[PDB]
């Protein structure tokens, strides 16, 4: 209802303009409005939704990391007692980030996932669900940390199961899902061996399927394969 008076097509058009202008908060609000029109999203529209929120939350995560590092240093032995300001401001950014994640998860639950029947859309949305629970997990410290982690795991796992049955090993969504689930294992679940095994198997199975692809699809798939390789090089 924030965007309730604007046409769906105008919201999509403005999301594209906002992307060009690097106005990602606007882009996300336009795409939220488009989702709330109640129609399913096309492939291009799903990518616009993902780009918008990834850039918004990406800035929040980077800021949270800067502030958390300062806060940790302030809590080292020998640090001069500053007041509550670093914690207060880290908490402010954290609450904002959590709100963005909750907004995305809300769109997925009402009602993107339940209407998504094709593999490409359902895997995309379940990957997104895993990603935004993962971002919640990065800042979680309380009673629900374990349940947040399990929610990320469960979403990624359902997406993996579908992708393995319904998509070729080079499919970019499948590859990006596996990349991110492998990061979840390494950074969130304290499972570096699972992370490495998943990245290696994903890379090798994609390599063996490249021969089936056109030049343009080959370019798309090898770009994400390189990210798997980059992580394996960091981790081994």
């Amino acid at each position: 209802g924030a965007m309730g008076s604007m046409e769906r097509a105008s919201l999509i058009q403005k999301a594209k303009l906002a992307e060009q202008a690097e106005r990602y908060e606007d882009m996300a609000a336009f795409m939220k409005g488009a989702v709330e029109k109640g129609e399913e999203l096309s492939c291009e529209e799903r990518n616009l939704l993902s780009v918008a929120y990834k850039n918004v939350v990406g800035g929040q995560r980077a800021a949270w990391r800067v502030l958390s590092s300062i806060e940790q240093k302030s809590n080292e032995e020998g640090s001069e007692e500053k007041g509550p300001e670093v914690r207060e401001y880290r908490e402010k950014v954290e609450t904002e980030l959590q709100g963005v994640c909750d907004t995305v998860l809300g769109l997925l639950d009402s009602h993107l996932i339940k209407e998504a029947g094709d593999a490409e859309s359902r895997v995309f949305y379940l990957k997104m669900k895993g990603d935004y629970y993962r971002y919640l997990a990065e800042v979680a410290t309380g009673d629900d940390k374990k349940r947040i982690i399990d929610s990320a795991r469960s979403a990624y796992q359902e997406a993996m199961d579908i992708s393995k049955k319904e998509m070729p090993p080079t499919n970019p969504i499948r590859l990006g899902l596996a990349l991110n689930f492998s990061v979840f294992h390494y950074e969130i679940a304290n499972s570096p061996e699972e992370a490495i095994s998943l990245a290696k198997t994903t890379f090798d199975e994609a390599m063996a399927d490249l021969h089936t692809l056109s030049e343009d699809s080959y370019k798309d798939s090898t770009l994400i394969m390189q990210l798997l390789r980059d992580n394996l090089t960091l981790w081994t």
Partner: peptide
Amino acid sequence: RRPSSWRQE
């Protein structure tokens, strides 16, 4: 360093 995820940026 922090590991790479997709999409980037």
